[PDB]
Amino acid sequence: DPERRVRSTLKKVFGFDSFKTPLQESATMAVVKGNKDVFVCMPTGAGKSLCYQLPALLAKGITIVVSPLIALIQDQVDHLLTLKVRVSSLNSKLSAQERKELLADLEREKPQTKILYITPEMAASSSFQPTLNSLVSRHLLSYLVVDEAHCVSQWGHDFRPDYLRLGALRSRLGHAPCVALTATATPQVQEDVFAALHLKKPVAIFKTPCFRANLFYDVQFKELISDPYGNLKDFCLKALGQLSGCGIVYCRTREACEQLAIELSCRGVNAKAYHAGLKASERTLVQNDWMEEKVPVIVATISFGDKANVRFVAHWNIAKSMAGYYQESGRAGRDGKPSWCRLYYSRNDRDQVSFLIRKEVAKLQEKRGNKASDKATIMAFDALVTFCEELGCRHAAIAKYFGDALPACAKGCDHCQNPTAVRRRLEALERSSS
Numbered sequence: 293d294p295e296r297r298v299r300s301t302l303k304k305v306f307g308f309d310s311f312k313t314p315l316q317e318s319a320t321m322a323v324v325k326g327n328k329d330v331f332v333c334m335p336t337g338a339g340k341s342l343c344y345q346l347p348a349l350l351a352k353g354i355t356i357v358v359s360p361l362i363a364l365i366q367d368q369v370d371h372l373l374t375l376k377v378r379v380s381s382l383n384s385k386l387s388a389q390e391r392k393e394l395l396a397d398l399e400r401e402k403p404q405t406k407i408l409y410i411t412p413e414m415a416a417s418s419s420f421q422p423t424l425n426s427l428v429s430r431h432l433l434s435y436l437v438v439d440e441a442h443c444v445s446q447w448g449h450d451f452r453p454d455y456l457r458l459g460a461l462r463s464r465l466g467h468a469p470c471v472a473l474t475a476t477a478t479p480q481v482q483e484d485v486f487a488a489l490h491l492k493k494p495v496a497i498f499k500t501p502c503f504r505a506n507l508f509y510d511v512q513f514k515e516l517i518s519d520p521y522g523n524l525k526d527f528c529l530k531a532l533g534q535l536s537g538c539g540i541v542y543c544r545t546r547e548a549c550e551q552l553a554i555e556l557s558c559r560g561v562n563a564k565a566y567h568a569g570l571k572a573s574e575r576t577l578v579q580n581d582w583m584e585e586k587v588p589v590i591v592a593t594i595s596f597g598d599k600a601n602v603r604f605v606a607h608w609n610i611a612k613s614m615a616g617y618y619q620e621s622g623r624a625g626r627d628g629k630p631s632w633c634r635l636y637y638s639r640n641d642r643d644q645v646s647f648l649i650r651k652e653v654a655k656l657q658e659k660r661g662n663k664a665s666d667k668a669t670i671m672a673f674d675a676l677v678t679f680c681e682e683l684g685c686r687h688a689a690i691a692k693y694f695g696d697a698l699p700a701c702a703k704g705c706d707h708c709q710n711p712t713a714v715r716r717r718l719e720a721l722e723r724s725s726s
């Protein structure tokens with residue numbers, strides 16, 4: 293029984309009685325089994341770390357774990373040191389004395405080190421190779437783990453050249469299985485991971501689906517609304533009337549944030565602005581006022597840094613990216629009860645956000661020259677423009693983006709609930725500028 297061994301270690305070392313989801317459990321079992329290569333794609337906070345850290349302890353040899361930054365290695369190392377586990381790290385920030393003590397440990401038979409964190413630069417170093425081949429010689433490597441695996445991809449919004457070295461490394465440790473883990477969930481990033489890391493076919497995939505059936509999506513066009521602030525007012529109120537629950541209004545500028553909270557409060561719905569301009573004392577009062585439910589609606593530019601009963605998330609201005617919008621809106625309806633997600637689109641608004649992105653990309657060019665990755669920035673915005681202008685199910689467009697199959701829309705979107713309503717609105721959009 294592996295399930296005995298897993299259950300024991302989850303308690304005795306990690307101090308958990310259960311797995312956060314069955315998907316975390318399914319992934320973790322496949323890694324223990326050790327026959328296949330594995331891809332774990334779950335949101336940040338889902339406990340991806342556990343899926344390789346636990347199996348490493350049940351194995352005979354050493355697990356090598358590649359993480360992008362010494363700052364994230366250190367947090368991991370300290371976490372595991374407070375749980376009485378034999379874990380070390382190899383990097384520039386170590387002394388030459390400590391570096392000699394660790395390399396000595398690796399050149400014994402049956403070393404004390406059980407998990408070795410290393411950067412991709414250090415894994416691809418000249419100075420590391422004798423040690424690495426010595427571990428290969430003596431069949432002392434149980435696994436190879438590549439955390440933050442999206443770093444291989446130009447489409448993944450954090451490219452790192454050194455991650456492309458990890459492929460050849462992988463085929464040299466062919467005896468041992470490889471686990472690749474990320475929160476970025478686009479199909480192209482997954483294609484890039486599979487080829488860049490020379491993963492072995494059939495890959496066992498553990499992927500959180502991005503369809504939530506309890507969310508209603510719609511997209512209104514501001515060019516067509518006679519009374520914009522009142523349209524929003526009614527929306528907020530309807531979502532709070534079955535008062536009950538809370539809501540979020542997102543927007544881009546400080547000025548619009550303030551005007552929005554004034555216009556909502558003046559027209560029968562209590563609301564307070566929330567942005568980086570105001571003082572940190574006043575920031576935290578608005579935060580606390582929304583959490584304990586004195587004030588039901590918060591109008592914001594930026595996150596706090598959980599909340600179960602958000603009955604609506606409204607976007608006043610189009611977001612910078614599809615991943616952006618999916619994250620932001622998806623703060624709605626965590627309790628499982630019906631919520632509403634609305635996006636107020638306009639073509640002038642689209643142009644403003646479009647201009648800003650490109651001006652930001654020019655700055656990065658001035659600084660470091662042209663990069664293939666800047667097209668990923670543009671495409672990510674464009675996917676959300678298409679979402680706004682196309683006749684189609686809302687949830688499916690989201691699904692298409694993250695490479696999921698056609699989800700069953702329970703009339704859970706404006707398009708599917710009434711295809712012709714939406715068509716009539718898209719015809720009148722085009723008549724506006726006739």
Ligand SMILES: Nc1ncnc2c1ncn2[C@@H]1O[C@H](COP(=O)(O)OP(=O)(O)O)[C@@H](O)[C@H]1O
Binds near residue numbers: 310312
């Ligand atoms: N089975 C579990 N039960 C409860 N909490 C867990 C479990 N597994 C992991 N966690 C916790 O969840 C948090 C997030 O985990 P982490 O591995 O950093 O997530 P990810 O890397 O996917 O973003 C950590 O504090 C971790 O201790």
Ligand SMILES: O=C(NC[C@H]1CCCO1)NC1CCCCC1
Binds near residue numbers: 335475478502615694
């Ligand atoms: O699915 C999520 N989860 C959204 C979470 C992240 C923080 C708040 O919401 N994000 C991932 C990362 C971006 C592309 C693939 C999807």
Ligand SMILES: [Mg+2]
Binds near residue numbers: 340341439
């Ligand atoms: Mg992680």
Ligand SMILES: [Zn+2]
Binds near residue numbers: 685687688706
């Ligand atoms: Zn639909």
